[PDB]
Every structure is written in C-alpha cells, then in structure tokens.
Design a binder for this molecule. Structure first.
Ligand code: HEM
Ligand SMILES: CC(=O)OC/C=C(\C)CC/C=C(\C)CCC=C(C)C
Ligand SMILES: [N+]
Length: 423
C-alpha cells in the first residue's frame, strides 16, 4: 500500500464512548479505527444495541443488537428458527416490497428457503461446474493479460480492470449470457451496486428501471433455455426439480439478481483486499509465491478472513433470547458482525497477523455456518486462488501503490479504487 504497517499490528484502543455504529462518520473511518472499535465491543460490550444509520430525510428503521463474538455469531447462524433471515438481511431495507426480488433465497426462512436452495443447488451439475471452473481460469487469465496490454505504463486500477470484472464475467459465463450482452449486464449491475453511494448520483427511478430491466433480461434468458437447452446454469436451473417443484423464470431471475450482487461485489472486495494485504505484507506474498498450489487453501482462506467482504448480516428474532446475560426481544433486529468475529481473540491466535499459512482458520466471512452458508463459497475461493495465480504467473511483482479509495458502507468492506503497478 503506501502506509507502512507491520504485520501483526493491533488496532488502536478505541474507548467505548467513542464507538457509534449508528453513525455514518464511524463507517467512513479507516479499518484501524473500526477494528479497534469492534475489539472494544468484544471485550467490553460484546452484545450491544445500536440505532441504525440515519440517512437524513429518509426512514431509518429500528435499532439492532450487534453480535461481535464469533461464538455468538456462530450460534445465531446455526439457529435460523430463532434468528430469521426474513424479511431481509440488511439493517434497514429501503425497498421491502422487493426484498425477495433482489434477495432470492437469502431473505427466506424455511421451509421456503430450503426448497429454493435445494433446487438451485441441484442445478450445479458436474458439466455446469466444470464449465464454471474453466471460465474462472479463462477470464482471470484474459483479464490479467488485458491489464498488461492496456497498460504499457505498468499501472492500473485493480478494481476496474480485474477485481470488478472477473466475478461478474464468471456469473455471465455460467448463465450462458452472450458476450455481446456483457456491457448491458455490467451497466445494469453497476447501477444496482452503485445506488445509494454518495458519489454515484443514481436516482431511485433509474435504479428501479435498471432493476426491472435486468430481471426481465434474466426471465427472457431463462425462457429461451426452456426451448433451447444449453450446457449453462440457466438451462440447468430451468430443468432442475426437487420433489416435483421447479423454478419459474421469475425465480431464476431473482436468483440471478442476487448473484450479480452477492456473488460479485463480495469476491471483488476479497480480491482487492487480498491484493492490498499481499502488498502490505510482502513476506506473505513471497511465501505464497514460493509454494502457490501448496499454500493456496490457507492463503485464500486467510484472504477471506482478512477481507471479510461482508461486514455483517442482519437477522430478526422470532422469540426472546438471552445470552451473555443480555435479553434480546422477539422482533428485535440482530446483526452478525463477521468483521468482528474474524478478529475474535478467543478463536484466532494472533488475530492481527495476515498469515497465508494460517491453520486452523475458522473464519466466518462466508457466514457463521448453517442454513444460509454462502452457496458460492467454494466458487469464491476458486476465483481468489485463480486470480492470484494468474497475477503470479503474468505480473508476479504486482503491488498496490496507494491506500485504496474505501467504499462508504456498513455492509460491504468495499474498495472503490486500488492502484497497482507491475514490472
Ligand atoms: C469472497 C466472496 C464471498 C463472500 C464473503 C460471501 C459471503 C456470503 C455471506 C456472508 C452469505 C450469508 C451467509 C449466512 O447468512 O450465513 C452469503 C450467501 C450467499 N452467497 Fe456468498 N459470498 C461470496 C461469494 C459468493 C459467490 C461467488 C457466490 C456465487 C454463487 C455467492 C452466492 C451466495 C448465495 C446464493 C447466498 C445465499 C445462500 C442462502 O441464503 O442460502 N457468494 N455469501
Ligand atoms: C442496493 C442493492 O444492492 O440492491 C437492493 C438490495 C437491497 C435493498 C437489500 C440488499 C441485500 C442484498 C442485495 C443481498 C446481498 C448479499 C450479499 C452482498 C452477500
Ligand atoms: N453521524
């Protein structure tokens, strides 16, 4: 990066009185402050109740109980009957009438959840998976090679040229989406991901129109595969069946919309954060680059722990709960701070060390476990592995050259711009 930081440096002590999770100012602070704040919560107030971020002039919603300890987050995850994912998994849903439209299975509880997830899982047939794995390698290889051909100067923004496009190109390939439609899908996806960001001034009207357009695209794509079988995920989604239940084109479209967010910005930020850490801790980059295949599993897992691309997921209590002697009421919101669990001193030795050999690594960046456990976790690990493999092969000395431009977000640990250079 630019800022010298010794591997293993703990975050500053942040006094409890200085932590305001309900403050947009809090989420704009650097990671050192945020990590130190969650370190304080874990030690002094591991379960605590916060108001949601108020966007002045817009409805804010009711507050939430922050779970900051790995054990609590794991417990909440493994009890979806108490900690519901319906109505939604963000602190405050700005379009609650569209919660299932954008959320597909992630906003569902059982039995609806298990039915949808089972049928979707069935669609990942060996032939479809093999195509996905080939796509991961091909797209990573192509995007890194193109970075080189597009930048004779040896510098680029990792996010725009690689971390951003790779996950979405992979989702497009698995849905069987023609190369010519990539620009449209990219534009729609970026408007959706960009909505609400201070700098991307997209209005709600454009956001809705884009949201319906990409849904209509996906329904049309699904409908085409009902007549024209192909070896893509879309066809296997239309053909998959569990206990006689099949997916409508509308349900497939909502799952696609989930993927272009949940399968996309997450992996993007894992990659960018992994690049930043491998840049800040060059001994870890040397270790991995010296034994790439042998260390890939622990290196990737450590990148996910380190990045925690999903900062939190929200649950809603169906029943009163008591735990760490803290009474939480039925109907209360609960938030699972993976960013905090992934630094929990009770679970990880040397939590502040980015260690590509880390083992064990019970990181919950894909969630605490249980029913909603990241459907694409293995795909994400593969994308991470392969993209760093292609960087190792084509530009082994690539390094971040500047601190990243951070996404202002409570939900996504986002990097907007990560300058890199290579020789
Ligand atoms: C580094 C990248 C990723 C991270 C950190 C991440 C994280 C997560 C998290 C935290 C959840 C909620 C887990 C829970 O509530 O217990 C989730 C769900 C999900 N993810 Fe991922 N994810 C990533 C990549 C992907 C990819 C590549 C896919 C592509 C298939 C994907 C598909 C999904 C789906 C479909 C769900 C909802 C599963 C359900 O509700 O049952 N994810 N992800
Ligand atoms: C702004 C936007 O993204 O679309 C509207 C979505 C809303 C208002 C709810 C947001 C929740 C999701 C999109 C599920 C995403 C899951 C992961 C990233 C892991
Ligand atoms: N604030």
């Amino acid at each position: 990066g630019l800022l010298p930081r010794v591997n293993g440096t703990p975050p500053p002590e942040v006094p409890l009185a200085d932590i305001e999770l309900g403050s947009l100012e809090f989420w704009g602070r650097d990671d050192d402050f945020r990590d130190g704040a969650f370190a304080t919560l874990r030690r002094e107030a591991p379960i605590s109740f916060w108001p949601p971020i108020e966007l002045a002039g817009l409805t804010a919603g009711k507050g939430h109980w922050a779970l900051t300890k790995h054990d609590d987050i794991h417990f909440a995850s493994r009890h979806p009957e108490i900690f519901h994912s319906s109505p939604n998994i963000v602190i405050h849903d700005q379009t609650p009438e569209l919660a299932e439209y954008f959320g597909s299975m992630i906003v569902l509880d059982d039995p609806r959840h298990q039915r949808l997830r089972s049928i979707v899982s069935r669609a990942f047939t060996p032939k479809v998976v093999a195509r996905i794995e080939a796509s991961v390698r091909e797209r990573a290889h192509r995007l890194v090679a193109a970075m080189i051909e597009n930048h004779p100067d040896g510098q680029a923004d990792l996010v725009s040229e690689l971390a951003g496009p790779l996950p979405l190109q992979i989702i497009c390939d698995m849905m069987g989406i023609p190369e010519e439609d990539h620009e449209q899908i990219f534009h729609w996806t970026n408007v959706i991901l960009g909505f609400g960001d201070p700098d991307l001034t997209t209005d709600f009207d454009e956001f809705l129109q884009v949201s319906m357009a990409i849904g209509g695209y996906a329904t049309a794509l699904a409908d085409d595969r009902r007549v024209n079988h192909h070896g893509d995920l879309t066809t296997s989604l239309v053909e998959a069946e569990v206990d006689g239940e099949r997916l409508s084109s509308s349900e497939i479209a909502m799952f696609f919309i989930l993927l272009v967010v949940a399968g996309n910005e997450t992996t993007r930020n894992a990659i960018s954060h992994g690049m930043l850490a491998l840049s800040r801790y060059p001994d870890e980059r040397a270790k991995w680059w010296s034994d790439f295949d042998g260390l890939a599993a622990t290196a990737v897992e450590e990148i996910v722990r380190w990045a925690s691309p999903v900062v939190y997921m929200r649950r809603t209590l169906s029943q009163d709960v008591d735990l760490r002697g803290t009474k939480m009421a039925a109907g209360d919101k609960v938030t699972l701070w993976y960013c905090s669990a992934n630094r929990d001193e009770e679970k990880f030795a040397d939590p502040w060390t980015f260690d590509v050999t880390r083992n064990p690594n019970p990181q919950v960046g894909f969630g605490g476990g249980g029913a909603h456990f990241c459907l694409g976790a293995n795909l994400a690990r593969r994308e991470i592995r392969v993209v760093f493999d292609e960087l190792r092969r084509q530009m082994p000395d690539v390094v971040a050259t500047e601190e990243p431009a951070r996404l202002l977000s409570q939900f996504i640990h986002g990097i907007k711009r990560l300058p890199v250079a290579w020789s």
